[model samples]
Target chain A: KELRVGVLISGRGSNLEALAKAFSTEESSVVISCVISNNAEARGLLIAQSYGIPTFVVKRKPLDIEHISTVLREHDVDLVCLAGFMSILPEKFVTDWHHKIINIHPSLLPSFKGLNAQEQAYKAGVKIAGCTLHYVYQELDAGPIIMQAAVPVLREDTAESLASRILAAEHVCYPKGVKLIAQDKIKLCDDGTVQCTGEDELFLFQENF
Target chain B: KELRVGVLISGRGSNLEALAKAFSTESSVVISCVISNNAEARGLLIAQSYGIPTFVVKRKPLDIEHISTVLREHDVDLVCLAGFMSILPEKFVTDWHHKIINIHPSLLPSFKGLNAQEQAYKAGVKIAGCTLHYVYQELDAGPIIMQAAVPVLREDTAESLASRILAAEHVCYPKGVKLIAQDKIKLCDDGTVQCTGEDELFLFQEN
Candidate 1:
């Protein structure tokens, strides 16, 4: 059976678009059943609608994950991918999804955990930076990383330049990550760790040098 | 022309064994020689058994340059650090830019210093893995080329986790070498790698 995916977005939805484009075909093992955005005017919602995917707006103030969870359950979504979703999912909701929820972070993780990670790396004077894909946990960006790609921090790189490269990596990492889950290659051990069995190759992307 | 490889080892040479086992048959690459920092390293025995030349370049004050000279004398096209515990001199890394590759037991950009498996276990991570990357002037920090991940069981001690990651290292490192030899890997001026392929699908493993 094909896995049904529900995407949550709050902004431009570039990551959402990456996922949608990856699984848009009939041959894909996963299907994007719906896209839900907090802001009705979110451009991502428009992207979803353009793909003929179902879209919903859960526009209550401070946002309610429970209401969103109910909507997801109604759509029979098997997995939830958060792509630039601005709101924090409640702890209970994260637990409910468990291994089924995944997120892409802009930094290599455990290095820059919260917001403004690109800027954080720029200020830290580090020589390498990248992105991480991991299971969603109650805490923010503190889950088991499934994939990561590193890019060198050039001497002249500004926060925006670093962010641009990291985002390019995210575009490649997120889709491959979704494909891994959809193919049943990712399994959570009886222990808390995630086991991905199919390929040992890590998704790596680099720009000119 | 067959790519000549010089392997560096420090102890048991488990990774050396993996690479030797991988390229044992006829291929575009050959294990030209095996160099160890330890004279008694079991890896030297493995290399001897394979009939490949072996040498010991034990830790010495001026030995870094001497060892680099030996590798050059061997006509080593690439240098592979397989369980070699020596910290490479900055001059050596610069001398062989895009040619020296090393493997680490952790996913990297995390648990970077030493005893990486222990670091991963201490951090309470749920996943553990290995990385293959181009060795730079800094320690383990480099342009990553390949990585393979395995589950970190709740019952796993550092040793047990290290064992699991080592198994992944065996599978990942050889393939990384094959890619390098095939010219599929492109190292950019900015220190990023671009692997050429039709759909960029080789980035993911398939069953």
Candidate 2:
């Protein structure tokens, strides 16, 4: 049986789409069990439905981790993939899930943590920007990095152009990272460090300018 | 005949060491020459020890045309930039075109100019990585070939992060150059890159 994955989204589920596409094969040994969106207007909910994957809409004013956790349990999800989830997860919720939750951030972490990271990179006049797939923790985007892919910043690039390229990279990186976790190919060292050992072929990052 | 690689260096040339090690085997590629802008660059000594030809151009006012002419004379099929500090004139970069490759300490489009590691650290990023790309005139802006990332530890300073990134650069840059030398990479007219060798592309983060 394939490992079941529960995806959470707040906006466009671009990463979710990537994950679904990559995990569709039997060899991958994974499936998207359910998708839950915090925004009713989120276009990603429609994407999940098109995939025939069950989806839920849970609007939150203060954010309810308990209700969301219950929904995940009902779906029998073994893992949670956050795709553009904008909410700051509660400490207890993050602790409960621990290494079970993963997220893809637009900027190299420790640099641009919160929203509008692409804009921040453009404003800073950075020559390069990329994406990072990581374990989710209580400290925002601060988590152990599973993988990263870089996209060069063109001179003509605006914030939107840079973000568009980075989003494409995220699609490639997130699914591969998830596969490593699902197959039990990751080794967690004693110091809370993680090492990946699996199909070495999964690590290739297609170079797109 | 093996492809002849001319390396450009300005410092320790750690990236050069990685390239030489990877290409040391027969029937592949060979390091034909090592040139440095600084006469006292440590990389020159390393190249001489490897029995590769070495040259130094320490003239006060830089002459890029002469350097380019020298590279051509050495019959260099590829130019691998390993910490080459001097900025080549726009004409030189254009002249080399797809033949020149360089490794940078930061992810491109993030920290382009000098002190990339410092900029990344100062930006308070949680993840930092390195990139290898085709050289272009607009500073570090170029078409990326490969990248490898390492987590920016909470305790990491600029120096520590730099050391970590340099290690990654060593691994990624050599493989990128080799792919080009083998004619496995095709740069499309649309500016996208298509690489033929799957095994070569998958070498990221193996070490």
TM-score of every candidate's chain A: 0.92, 0.93
Give model 2 RMSD, 1 decimal. Answer: 9.0
Local accuracy of candidate 2 as per-residue lDDT tens digits, A79-143: 99999987888898898887899888887655677888888766754445678777887777777
Tens-digit lDDT string for candidate 2 (B1-207)? 478899999888788888878877765788889999988799888898788888888656776766787788889988989889887877788788988988888766567889999887665454567877788878887776766666565456699889888888877877777777788887656564557665433222322
- In the range B1-207, model 1's lDDT, one tens digit per residue, is 378899988889889888989987867888888988888899899899999998887576537866787788889999999988867777788889889999988866678877999878766554457778889888887877776656555356889888888888888888888888877877666555656742120122212
Q: Which candidate is the best by DockQ?
A: 1
Q: In candidate 1, which residue pairs clash? A: A199-B205, A209-B188, A209-B189, A209-B190, A209-B192
* Model 2 CAPRI quality: incorrect
Full-model lDDT, candidate 1: 0.78
Q: What is the C-alpha RMSD of each candidate to the true structure, in Å?
A: 8.5, 9.0
Query: Distance from true position, residue A138, model 2, in Å?
Result: 20
For every model in order, what is the number of clashing pairs?
5, 14
Instruction: Compose the digit string of candidate 1's lDDT tens values, residues A1-209.
Output: 38899999988888888888888777788888889898877899889988999898896576877878898999899989888887878788888887788888888777788888999776654445678788887778988777777665654577999898888888888888788877778766564655567654444545333
